[PDB]
């Protein structure tokens, strides 16, 4: 998308729609703590099912 938008030129519609998806990096720190803390419950629930 980046390359071809540059090739034809103009304000790309697709880039404009998903602006946050392109310009912001995804951060794992906020998440993995809670995945590990959540683990004991997840396993228990799956076992019960």
């Amino acid at each position: 998308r980046l390359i071809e938008a540059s090739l034809y030129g103009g304000i790309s519609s697709a880039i404009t729609r998903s602006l946050r998806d392109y310009l912001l990096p995804e951060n794992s720190g906020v998440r993995k703590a809670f995945q590990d803390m959540e683990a004991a419950l997840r396993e228990n629930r799956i076992t019960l099912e």
Partner: protein, 50 residues
Amino acid sequence: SSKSVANIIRKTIQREQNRIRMLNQGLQAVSFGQVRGVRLNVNVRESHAI
């Protein structure tokens, strides 16, 4: 719990805002016809701010 999570979220938000602000300065005073500058405007949604 609680406050510490809020602090890490706030610091991440602050760092992203600052980096964007740095990128933003490189684009000042670019002349394209009648356009004279470009910016990436970053804001925080209310429903999440509260």
